[PDB]
Design a protein around this ligand. Sequence first.
Ligand SMILES: C[C@@H]1CC(=O)Nc2cccc(-c3cnn(C(C)(C)C)c3)c2N1
Length: 114
Amino acid sequence: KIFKPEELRQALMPTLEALYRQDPESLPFRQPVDPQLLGIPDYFDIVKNPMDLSTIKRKLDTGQYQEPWQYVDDVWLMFNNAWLYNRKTSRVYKFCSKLAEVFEQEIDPVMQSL
Ligand SMILES: C[C@@H]1CC(=O)Nc2cccc(-c3cnn(C(C)(C)C)c3)c2N1
């Protein structure tokens, strides 16, 4: 079952754009995590596979998803990392939860049509 990269990009990009459109909630997820800059030096001790919106976008732009479930899994990896690393009072944790609510609504019909 083949998916062309340009085909995946057409179907999935709007679902990623939906996440970028969320303010304030997408701001902490827009760039790769830099632990030293952010003052979280144990981040890579805890989060073994960091993921962020810019990376997911670069993967779509450069044809690095073979099939669309891998994209969904990257988005969820980004959420799961934030729910693992942060406490429940943190903005980052609560913002993650909002992004996951938005993503589910967008991704559902797109995955059904694929
Ligand atoms: C997702 C990432 C890593 C994480 O899980 N927790 C985290 C902790 C502190 C700041 C951040 C954080 C990242 N960017 N920001 C900005 C305030 C937008 C610069 C804060 C943060 N977010």
